[PDB]
Design a protein around this ligand. Sequence first.
Ligand SMILES: FC(F)(F)Sc1ccc(Nc2ncnc3ccccc23)cc1
Ligand SMILES: FC(F)(F)Sc1ccc(Nc2ncnc3ccccc23)cc1
Lengths: 542, 542
Amino acid sequence: TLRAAVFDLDGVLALPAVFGVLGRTEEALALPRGLLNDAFQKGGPEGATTRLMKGEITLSQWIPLMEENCRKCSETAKVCLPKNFSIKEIFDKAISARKINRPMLQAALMLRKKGFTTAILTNTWLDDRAERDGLAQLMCELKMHFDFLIESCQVGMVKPEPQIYKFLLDTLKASPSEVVFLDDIGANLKPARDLGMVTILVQDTDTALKELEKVTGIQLLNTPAPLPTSCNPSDMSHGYVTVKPRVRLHFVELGSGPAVCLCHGFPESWYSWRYQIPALAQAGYRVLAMDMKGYGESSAPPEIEEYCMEVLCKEMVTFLDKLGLSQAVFIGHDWGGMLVWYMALFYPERVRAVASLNTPFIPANPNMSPLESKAFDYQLYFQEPGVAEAELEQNLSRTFKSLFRASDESVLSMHKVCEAGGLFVNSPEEPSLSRMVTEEEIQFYVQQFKKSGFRGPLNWYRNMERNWKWACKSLGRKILIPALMVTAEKDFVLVPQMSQHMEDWIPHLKRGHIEDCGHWTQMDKPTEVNQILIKWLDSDAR
Amino acid sequence: TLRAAVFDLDGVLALPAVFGVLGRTEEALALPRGLLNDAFQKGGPEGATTRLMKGEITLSQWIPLMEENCRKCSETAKVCLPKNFSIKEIFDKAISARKINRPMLQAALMLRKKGFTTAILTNTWLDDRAERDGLAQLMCELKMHFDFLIESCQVGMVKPEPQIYKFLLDTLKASPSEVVFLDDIGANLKPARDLGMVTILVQDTDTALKELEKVTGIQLLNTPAPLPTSCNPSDMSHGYVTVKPRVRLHFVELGSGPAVCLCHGFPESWYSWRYQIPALAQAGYRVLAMDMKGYGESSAPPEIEEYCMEVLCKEMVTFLDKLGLSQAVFIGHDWGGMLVWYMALFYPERVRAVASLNTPFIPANPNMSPLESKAFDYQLYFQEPGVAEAELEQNLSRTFKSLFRASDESVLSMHKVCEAGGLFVNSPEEPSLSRMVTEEEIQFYVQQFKKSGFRGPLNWYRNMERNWKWACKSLGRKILIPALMVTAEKDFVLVPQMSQHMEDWIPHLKRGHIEDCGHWTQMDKPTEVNQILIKWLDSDAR
Ligand SMILES: FC(F)(F)Sc1ccc(Nc2ncnc3ccccc23)cc1
Ligand SMILES: FC(F)(F)Sc1ccc(Nc2ncnc3ccccc23)cc1
């Protein structure tokens, strides 16, 4: 019975194999078969390559020691090497062209979700080339998905020496019979076999995965499309910025590159971006997922006037100021989307690009008050301080389970809430668990709302007149910075139709649409949200 | 009697003035004198420029409204405009060439340090150009140095309307006679004069500063070179990352660009980089100033083995991992410098570049143990757990005041500490305040050391044998990534002479030296530390 899975990097989790490139180069340069592979493994355990794999020497130290081993191997073959020949050049392209073997990672991901202890076991070197980052980036992406990463140059042992295999077992804290090992090299496979481990020779991913699903008894091949990588809250970098004496803002930060500021809606968290954070950071962006004023680990002042658009926006500018950021791309959902359009209209120099999910940009009516624009029953229900708070705070588990659901799961009514006297009047006390959320994921929102409740979040609805008077100062402006509007087909609050005239105020407005998507866009359709944002960020946000 | 200073931006805090460019363009393009300035102020308070300055319209909306005002102004002059004429092009270079007027900022800085309430009052626009960032960056740099920033396009009022002047007074909470106002335009100066404010017409910075120092009674012109901008701890963005179950790391983060990880020494704080943080962030870098393991807001496990180089380095790699950073440039001082050389030798793919202050890279002697390499009396004094802790924790104010001092202030003895039985045996109970530190700055270190004391910091000294055995695995390697060694002339612990053979292991090693500089490099010689690091970062770290 198995509980551990071990993968090699070269030829198993990463394709094409770097080793195979030594052969291709001989075939392309019409060099005697094996010339470069003879120079590679020259001296065996006493040779330059073993010293490199054990961490005795770095990659840049090995490069000449390989070139002179290419000089010794050609003397035996009598032929001479070309003019534009560079060992560095061959390895640079070889390492560069090597990309993650997505199906192999998917299988590793699936095994780990089924309670397997996963690990990478590779014969690698200490990379000190000018272009070492590409590989550091690759290793970063892979490693997060595994329990352990055993690099030969770190452990000082190497494959096929049996010491690394006993080290593998001691690390995994498991009996060899509880271990599946996968390698593309028979030699590096034999010692695992001898110890009593299940071994899979990798020649093609499909057969290798067949052998894996055969022995594990878990579906790994042909399995449905997996959800994007999520966030474990405790494994994140949490940031805190005091924007003013009583007001502190919290964010979760991930990645390098242009600053991408994510603004959640009502009643949410930075956690509502759980599937976007790893994805956007992987796309080469510095993700700053906010806890908006009144939410989670951010300050929740009681006063209503503390949550009008002007103060909220001015506070987000101070956030940039204190973090040392002249600009950030502002991506907002729901009330976050509203904030994000005001950031663009009042502080365009602070906004690199602006993106909204479901929330349209609707210019204020200077004649009619927003309390009339009745023309949203829950809005009126939220006006009275204390009422909605008491209902939403009554049972937190119930509140989120009732709210957080797909279009095909709808259990909540937005119509005639006031006359019936409650948001959950015609709702079960123990609602069913939605297909978008796990019990654990709902508990995160429960834990966060236990800090300061719904007063702060609900105050975002209690500044209609202030927001209206303020927005009226922007009636002569146009949003001319890069902008994206993302509509969700089945959002019955923020309907796609409401966005139709947006090009009248944003001429260069780019668009995105998601079919069969509810209000809770990010958790409903994550893969497509990420696809839309990455494509727009790469084209309009640098 | 004055207590408030008000500066304009264009022509006062920023030179050359954008307004003057309208004249230069006429003079360069041989256009009828004033043509572009007539088109600029066309329509007066009902014109496009006033609408722009009040925030009714953005800069990109105004650009055509100015081009057609250049078409109307040329009909009256009868001449026609050239082919390669662009209003956007003129303003782009105009805004770009406008840089901070350093002496004017220095004077504002000096007034604020003398207890003045400082403010910027400018007639500006909402900038939505593709190149708006340059100006956003400029505004960011200036604003941090002032109590208030009143932008016309934000307040909806403009100069010379008297409403903005009464708004200025209400903001400052001061009587007009307690206010010095400075502008390069007589018109925008008159309403301040009428209200009873001190006014200074700016035509040349020197005369303007003479008038300022005359009326304020404070030396502003010819004054000594000021210290670089420091950090107010509460105004910083504080980051927290759990690197393992019991271990959490804290850092202060500022700026955008390549990640620069700052590693302090013993017995220090992220605060030891107070003068480098704003400077390096201003140079286009993402500063991550660490609280090393055992210090400040970071976890301080009691066990000695928790502070050996291998665990400390492996933990800094997890920090990169959890933050989503494939690489960072590692700048270390004292024990931080040591860490930083091991980061380069064991994880070169994670290090963009490596820099050390005072700490040389000395390869371990594989024959002789480090306990012999006696050939550092305080080292032996730190070996016994509890002894040094009790002395250093006895009076925290005394401990830092005795330690943190310049070469010309030396009161502490490193020689014969063990036989005398104490670090502060021949030291006063109430030491004098060093020229490098303020009483407040010493209290910050006192407050931080009150959390977990000296056990954690002192354990960095208690792993000699482990560090030695580990370092011996790197004896075959060379540091081939960009590297900088910065020696401090008067450091009697980490002497410049000790660095002499460093090129034997780091051939491409770049160097920096600071004359008349003690051990506490960063606070001793900040301006020169920043000068050296920025110059090396810009050339070797991208
Ligand atoms: F009401 C609940 F919480 F039960 S579901 C729900 C219902 C509505 C919204 N968003 C907005 N509502 C009203 N004006 C807005 C204006 C701008 C953006 C969002 C909104 C969120 C959740
Ligand atoms: F000792 C005090 F704290 F009183 S002054 C003082 C004295 C010495 C150091 N640095 C180092 N000491 C010993 N080995 C090292 C090895 C590497 C780096 C620094 C060191 C710091 C402060």
